[PDB]
A paper describes a structure:
The yeast THO complex is recruited to active genes and interacts with the RNA-dependent ATPase Sub2 to facilitate the formation of mature export-competent messenger ribonucleoprotein particles and to prevent the co-transcriptional formation of RNA:DNA-hybrid-containing structures. Among them is the transcription-export (TREX) complex, an evolutionary conserved complex containing a multi-protein assembly (transcription-dependent hyperrecombination complex THO), an RNA helicase (Sub2 in yeast/UAP56 in human), and an hnRNP-like protein (Yra1 in yeast/Ref/Aly in human). THO subunits Tho2 and Hpr1 intertwine to form a platform that is bound by Mft1, Thp2, and Tex1.
Focusing on the classification of the entire dataset on the rigid protomer, we improved the density map to 3.4 Å resolution, allowing us to build the atomic model of the pentameric THO protomer de novo. The final model includes the large N-terminal structured regions of the five THO-complex subunits as well as a prominent low-complexity sequence of Hpr1 (residue 501–675). The densities for Sub2 were modeled using the RecA domains from the reported high-resolution crystal structure. The two smallest THO proteins, Mft1 and Thp2, interact to form the ‘arm’ of the complex, a striking 200 Å long coiled-coil structure that is oriented diagonally with respect to the Tho2-Hpr1 platform. The Sub2-binding platform in the ‘body’ of the complex is formed by module-4 and module-5. In the rigid protomer, the RecA1 domain of Sub2 binds the concave surface of module-5 (Tho2 HEAT 16) and the helical insertion from module-4.
Numbering used by the authors:
A (entry chain A): 165 to 356, 394 to 667
B (entry chain C): 106 to 209
C (entry chain B): 97 to 241, 250 to 528
D (entry chain D): 99 to 169, 191 to 196
Write the structure that this text describes.
C-alpha cells in the first residue's frame, strides 16, 4: 500500500483503458490528413494514459504491435509519431552507421521490449507476424532509436549454440564433399527441427533483413568477426550482391555504353479491329507493394519493395578506382560465394574489358593490364570456379582474360589447381562434386548415347574445366 | 455538446478515406510513344476538376453546382455523338471509294 | 534550477562525497512542493526530464552506463520520496470529477518519471495482480439520465458483471454465468448485424465501381481481391481542398488546446450513464470505433477467464494474491466441479472464438491480426509475470569500446616461376 | 471555472454546426459522382442517346449531313 506504483500493465487489468488507446491508434492509420495532426494524437494519447493509469512499458508495446500491423504503407506516419513522442532518445540518440558507435546510445527500455518480442516463435499465431515485426524493428534500428548490439546480444540463439551448429555444418559438409555419397538409383529396390529454427528466426533472420533494408554496416561488422556464418544460409550472399550491384550499376552504364541502347525496352500495344478499322491501345497494369525485395511482374500487375528509400545511405561509384576501394570491403566478405550471382561476374568483366579498350593507344596500358591481372586473380577467378553448368559467365570472364600474357593465365590456372582447391572449403566441395560428376558421365559414353551425353559433357566441361 | 462534437469528428474523418467513392476511370491516352500505363496517374479533365472542386467551396451552394454538372454532362454527350455520327458515314464511304480507285 | 545544478556541480568538494545524493533529492522534493498550479508544473518538468541521468546514481560520483540504475524502493534516498510521490499521485487520482486535462498530463509525467527511474525488474515497478476498479467512462455525474432503455440496461449489466470483475464472473454458482449469458447474447447479435451492414455497404460500392471500370476498358480484368481503402483521385491531387481541410483542423485544434476549455472528456469515452447517447454511439453504421472497443474488451476478459479456468496453474497464483491481501474471502478457488467449469469454458470459447474471429476472418482481415496478436501477447506477459519477471533480469549490456576495423587492401605477389610449375 | 459555463457554450456550438455543414457538402459531392458514373454506364450499354435535335444537330454536326439523317439514337460507346 505504501511503495507500489498503482498502475495497470496487463491488458485485462484496465480493459477500458487499453481499449480506447488501441482504437485511437487504428484511427491514426485510417486518416488521410494523419501526417499534419501528429501533435494532436500525441496529446490525446497522453491525456488517455493519464486518465486510466496505464504503464509506460506496456503502452509502448501496444503502440509497437498495432503499428507493425500497418507498417507497410504506414511507416512514414509511424516514424514521425515516434519522432515527436517523448519516448525517443533525444540526448543520446544511437548512430548505427559508424563502427565506433554500434553500441552506445538508444532507448534501453524499447530495447528490452523488442529483444523480448523477437524471441517468441513457439506458438502458432506469431509465426505469421514475425516477418512484419522484424521489418518494423529493422526500420527503427537505422534511424537511431536503438543501437544494434543492444539487440544483437539479447535475441534467442546464443553465440555458443550458433558456433556449435556451425561446427556441425562444417564437419558434415567437409565429409559429404571429400568422401561423397552414393545416390541410390535402383539400389535395394528389388531382390531375386532446431535447424529450421536457427535458419528461420532470431539472429540470422535479423541479419538478412538488416541487409535487405540497406543498412550494411552492422552486418559488415558482424561478418568481419565470424565469417563462417555465411555457411548457415545462402540468402546473405544474394542480398549482399544485390546491394553491391545497385552500388555499381551507374558506373557500369557510364562505360560499355548501354544508355544509347536503353531506348528499346517497350511493350507491344494491344491492337484490335473494330468496325473494320485498326485501333491501337496501351496495356494497363497496376502497382502493388510487398515485402519481397526483388521486383517482378506476375501476369497483370507489378510488385515492388515497399520501403522505397532503402538506398538513401549509399552512393554509387564514380570511378573505377572507387570500385577497387569498395571491392576490398564487400567482395572480400562475400568471398568465394560471388558465384551465386552470375550477373555480377558479367558486369565486372565488361567493365574491365571497356577500361582496357579505352586506352589501347596510350603508353601506360601495361599498368592497367597488371592491375586488372591482380584484381582478376584475387576476386573473380575463385568465384567463377564455383559455377554450375553456366557457360556464358565463364565465356565473359575469359573474354576479359584474353588480354593477358599466357604466362599469367597459366599462373592463375595452376595456382587455382594446386593451392586453392585444397585449403578452402566451398571451392573444395565444388571441385569434388564436379570431378565425381565427370567420372560418372565418362563411364557412360557410347556410340549410341552420344546425342545427349555430348551436350551434357560439353556443358560440364565448359563451366568448370580445370 | 462535446460528445456530439467528438462523435461527429469521428464520423467525418472516417468518411474521407474509407467510405469514399470515386470516378469510373475510363482511360484514353493521346501520345503514341507511351505503351504501358500505370492506371493510377489517370486524373479527370480540368473542366470536370474545377466543377467538382467548387463543391467544397465556402460560399457556393449545391443546387447550382448540380445544374452545372448536368450541363457539362449534356455537352459531353452532344459533342461525342456529333463527332461519332460525322466520322462514321461520310468518312467510311469516301475512304472505301478512294481505296477502290487507288487499287485500280 | 541554478541552485539545483550547483549542488550537483559542487559534489567533489563536499566532505562526504556520497552525501550529495540524499541532499540533492531533498532539495528537489521541496521545490516540487512549492509549484503553484499544474501549469507551472508542466512549465518546470522539462528540466527534471533533462537531468534524469543524475538521479540514477544514488551515491556513486561517476556516471552510470546508459541503461543501468542503482536505486531501490527501500534504500535511504527513496525511502520517503517514493512514499511522498505516491501520496501525491493518489491525491491527484482521488479528484475524479474536477480534473482538468492539465491534471491528467501532470499525473502522466509523474508516473513516467518514476517508472523510468527504477529498473523494470524491481519489486515495485510491476503491479502484483490488482485488477483495476473504477473503470467507468461516464460523464462524471453530468448529463446522467423502448429500445434505447433496454439496450442501455443490457450493456450496463454485462459490462459491470463481466468486464469490471472477470474473477467473480469466473467463479460463480451457475446462476450468475447463465444470467450474464442470457443478458449478453442479443447484444452481440445486434452489434454483429450492424457491422455486417457496414461492410456490406463498403463491398457494394467497391464491387459496382470495379465492374464498371472493367466493362469500360479493353483488357482491364480488375483484381477483386484487394480492398484496402485509397483516397479518391479528385482529392489526392487537389490543393484547394487540402488547404481548406488544414485550415479547419487548425481551427479545431486551437479550440481544444486553450485554457478556457480544459474540462473536456476524452475523444473515445462511451458514457454508460446517458442512455440515448449510448444508443446513438453504438448503433450508427458510420462510426464503428465504439463497437471495436466493445469487441476488444470482451476478447481481453474472455482470454483471462479461459486461462483461469483451464490452466489450473495461474489459479494458484491468483488465489495466493487474493489471500495475502485478505486472509478472509469467499471465492471457491477450488470448487470447479465440472457442471460450472463446463458452462464457463463453453461461453468463453463461444464468444471469443466461435463468433468474433469467425466473423473478422472473412471481412477486414486486419482487425483479425490485431486482436490475435494482442491476445497472444497478453498471455505471454501474464506467464512472464507469473515467474516474477525473471525474463528481464538478465540483459547483458555490452561495455566494450569498439575500434574501427582494418581492411587488407593489398594484393599478393608472384613467384619467380613465370609459368605454373617447375617442370613447364 | 466549473460554475460559469453558460458563457463558453456558444463558441463550441458554432464549431459543431460548422462541422455539420462540411459533412453535408462532402456527402453531396459523393452523391454527385454516383450520378455521373451512372450516366457513363448509359453510354457503354448499347446506344440510348435518343435525344432530339431541334435545329441544334444541324448547327453542330453540319447542314450537309443533316440531309442523310433526315432521310438520333446513335452509338457512342
Amino acid at each position: 500500500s505504501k511503495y507500489e506504483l498503482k498502475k495497470y500493465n496487463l491488458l485485462v487489468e484496465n480493459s477500458v483503458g487499453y481499449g480506447q488507446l488501441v482504437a485511437l491508434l487504428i484511427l491514426a492509420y485510417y486518416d488521410p490528413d494523419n501526417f499534419s495532426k501528429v501533435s494532436a494524437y500525441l496529446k490525446e494519447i497522453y491525456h488517455i494514459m493519464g486518465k486510466y493509469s496505464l504503464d509506460s512499458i506496456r503502452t509502448l508495446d501496444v503502440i509497437l504491435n498495432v503499428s507493425s500491423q500497418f507498417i507497410t504503407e504506414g511507416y512514414k506516419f509511424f516514424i514521425a509519431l515516434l519522432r515527436k513522442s517523448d519516448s525517443w532518445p533525444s540526448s543520446h540518440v544511437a548512430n548505427n552507421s559508424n563502427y565506433s558507435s554500434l553500441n552506445e546510445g538508444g532507448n534501453m527500455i524499447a530495447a528490452n521490449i523488442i529483444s523480448f518480442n523477437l524471441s517468441q516463435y513457439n506458438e502458432e499465431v506469431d509465426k505469421e507476424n514475425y516477418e512484419r515485426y522484424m521489418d518494423m524493428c529493422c526500420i527503427l534500428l537505422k534511424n537511431g532509436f536503438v543501437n544494434f548490439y543492444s539487440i544483437w546480444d539479447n535475441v534467442k540463439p546464443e553465440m555458443e549454440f550458433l558456433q556449435e551448429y556451425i561446427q556441425n555444418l562444417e564437419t558434415e559438409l567437409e565429409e559429404e564433399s571429400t568422401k561423397g555419397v552414393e545416390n541410390p538409383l535402383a539400389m535395394a529396390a528389388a531382390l531375386s527441427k532446431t535447424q529450421q529454427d536457427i535458419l528461420l528466426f532470431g539472429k540470422i533472420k535479423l541479419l538478412e533483413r538488416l541487409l535487405i533494408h540497406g543498412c550494411v554496416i552492422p552486418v559488415i561488422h558482424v561478418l568481419k568477426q565470424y565469417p563462417k556464418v555465411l555457411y548457415v544460409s545462402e540468402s546473405l550472399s544474394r542480398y549482399l550482391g544485390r546491394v553491391f550491384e545497385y552500388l555499381l550499376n551507374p558506373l557500369y552504364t557510364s562505360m560499355t555504353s548501354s544508355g544509347e541502347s536503353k531506348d528499346m525496352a517497350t511493350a507491344l500495344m494491344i491492337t484490335r479491329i473494330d468496325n473494320g478499322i485498326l485501333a491501337h491501345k496501351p496495356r494497363l497494369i497496376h502497382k502493388y507493394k510487398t515485402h519481397e525485395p526483388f521486383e517482378s511482374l506476375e501476369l497483370n500487375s507489378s510488385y515492388v519493395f515497399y520501403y522505397s528509400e532503402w538506398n538513401s545511405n549509399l552512393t554509387p561509384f564514380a570511378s573505377v578506382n572507387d570500385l577497387f576501394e569498395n571491392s576490398h570491403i564487400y567482395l572480400s566478405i562475400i568471398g568465394p560465394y560471388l558465384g551465386r550471382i552470375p550477373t555480377l561476374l558479367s558486369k565486372i568483366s565488361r567493365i574491365g574489358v571497356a577500361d582496357i579498350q579505352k586506352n589501347h593507344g596510350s603508353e601506360s596500358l601495361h599498368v592497367t593490364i597488371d592491375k586488372w591481372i591482380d584484381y582478376v586473380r584475387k576476386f573473380i577467378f575463385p568465384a567463377t570456379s564455383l559455377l554450375q553448368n553456366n557457360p556464358i559467365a565463364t565465356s565473359e570472364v575469359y573474354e576479359l582474360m584474353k588480354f593477358f600474357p599466357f604466362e599469367k593465365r597459366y599462373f592463375i590456372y595452376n595456382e587455382m589447381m594446386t593451392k586453392l582447391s585444397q585449403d578452402i572449403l566451398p571451392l573444395k566441395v565444388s571441385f569434388n562434386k564436379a570431378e565425381r560428376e565427370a567420372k560418372s558421365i565418362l563411364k557412360a559414353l557410347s556410340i549410341d548415347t552420344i546425342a545427349k551425353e555430348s551436350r551434357r559433357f560439353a556443358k560440364l566441361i565448359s563451366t568448370n574445366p580445370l | 455538446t462535446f460528445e456530439h462534437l467528438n462523435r461527429d469528428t469521428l464520423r467525418y474523418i472516417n468518411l474521407l478515406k474509407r467510405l469514399s467513392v470515386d470516378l469510373a476511370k475510363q482511360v484514353e491516352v493521346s501520345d503514341p510513344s507511351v505503351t504501358v500505363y500505370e492506371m493510377d496517374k489517370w486524373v479527370p479533365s480540368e473542366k470536370l476538376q474545377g466543377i467538382l472542386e467548387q463543391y467544397c467551396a465556402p460560399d457556393t451552394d449545391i443546387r447550382g453546382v448540380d445544374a452545372q454538372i448536368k450541363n457539362y454532362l449534356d455537352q459531353i454527350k452532344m459533342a461525342r455523338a456529333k463527332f461519332g455520327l460525322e466520322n462514321k458515314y461520310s468518312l467510311k464511304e469516301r475512304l472505301s471509294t478512294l481505296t477502290k480507285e487507288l487499287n485500280h | 534550477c541554478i541552485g539545483l545544478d550547483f549542488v550537483y556541480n559542487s559534489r567533489f568538494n563536499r566532505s562526504n562525497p556520497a552525501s550529495w545524493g540524499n541532499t540533492f533529492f531533498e532539495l528537489f522534493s521541496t521545490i516540487i512542493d512549492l509549484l503553484n498550479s499544474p501549469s507551472t508544473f508542466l512549465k518546470f518538468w522539462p528540466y527534471a526530464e533533462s537531468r534524469i541521468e543524475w538521479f540514477k546514481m544514488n551515491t556513486s560520483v561517476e556516471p552510470v552506463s546508459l541503461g543501468e540504475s542503482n536505486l531501490i524502493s527501500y534504500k535511504q534516498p527513496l525511502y520517503e520520496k517514493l512514499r511522498h510521490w505516491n501520496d501525491i499521485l493518489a491525491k491527484l487520482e482521488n479528484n475524479d470529477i474536477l480534473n482538468t486535462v492539465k491534471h491528467y498530463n501532470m499525473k502522466y509525467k509523474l508516473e513516467n518519471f518514476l517508472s523510468e527511474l527504477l529498473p523494470i525488474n524491481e519489486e515495485s515497478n510491476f503491479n502484483r495482480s490488482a485488477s483495476i476498479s473504477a473503470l467507468q467512462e461516464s460523464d462524471n455525474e453530468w448529463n446522467r439520465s423502448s429500445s434505447d432503455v433496454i439496450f442501455a440496461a443490457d450493456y450496463n449489466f454485462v459490462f459491470y458483471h463481466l468486464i469490471i470483475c472477470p474473477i467473480e464472473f469466473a467463479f460463480s454458482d451457475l446462476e450468475y454465468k447463465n444470467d450474464v449469458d442470457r443478458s449478453l447474447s442479443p447484444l452481440l447479435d445486434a452489434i454483429l448485424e450492424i457491422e455486417e451492414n457496414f461492410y456490406s455497404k463498403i463491398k457494394m460500392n467497391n464491387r459496382t465501381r470495379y465492374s464498371l471500370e472493367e466493362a469500360l476498358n479493353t483488357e482491364y480484368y480488375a483484381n477483386y481481391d484487394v480492398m484496402t481503402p485509397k483516397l479518391p483521385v479528385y482529392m489526392k491531387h487537389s490543393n484547394a481542398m487540402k488547404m481548406d481541410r488544414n485550415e479547419f483542423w487548425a481551427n479545431l485544434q486551437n479550440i481544444k488546446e486553450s485554457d478556457d476549455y480544459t474540462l473536456r472528456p476524452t475523444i473515445m469515452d462511451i458514457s454508460l450513464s446517458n442512455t440515448t447517447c449510448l444508443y446513438k454511439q453504438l448503433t450508427q453504421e458510420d462510426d464503428d470505433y465504439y463497437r471495436k472497443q466493445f469487441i476488444l474488451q470482451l476478447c481481453f476478459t474472455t482470454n483471462l477467464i479461459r486461462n483461469l479456468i483451464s490452466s489450473d496453474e495461474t489459479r494458484n497464483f491468483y488465489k495466493s494474491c487474493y489471500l495475502r491481501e485478505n486472509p478472509l474471502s469467499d471465492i471457491d478457488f477450488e470448487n470447479l466441479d465440472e457442471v460450472n467449469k463446463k458452462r464457463g469454458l463453453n461461453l468463453c470459447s463461444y464468444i471469443c472464438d466461435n463468433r468474433v474471429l469467425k466473423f473478422y476472418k472473412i471481412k477486414d482481415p486486419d482487425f483479425y491480426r490485431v486482436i490475435r496478436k494482442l491476445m497472444s501477447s497478453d498471455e505471454k506477459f501474464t506467464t512472464a509475470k507469473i515467474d516474477g519477471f525473471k525474463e528481464f533480469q538478465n540483459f547483458r549490456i555490452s561495455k566494450e569500446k569498439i575500434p574501427p576495423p582494418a581492411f587488407d587492401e593489398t594484393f599478393k605477389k608472384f613467384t619467380f616461376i613465370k609459368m605454373g610449375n617447375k617442370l613447364i | 471555472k466549473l460554475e460559469n459555463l453558460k458563457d463558453k457554450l456558444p463558441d463550441i456550438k458554432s464549431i459543431h454546426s460548422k462541422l455539420l455543414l462540411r459533412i453535408g457538402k462532402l456527402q453531396g459531392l459523393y452523391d454527385s459522382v454516383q450520378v455521373i458514373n451512372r450516366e457513363v454506364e448509359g453510354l457503354s450499354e448499347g446506344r440510348t442517346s435518343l435525344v432530339v435535335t431541334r435545329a441544334e444537330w444541324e448547327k453542330e454536326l453540319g447542314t450537309d449531313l443533316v440531309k442523310f439523317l433526315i432521310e438520333i439514337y446513335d452509338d457512342f460507346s
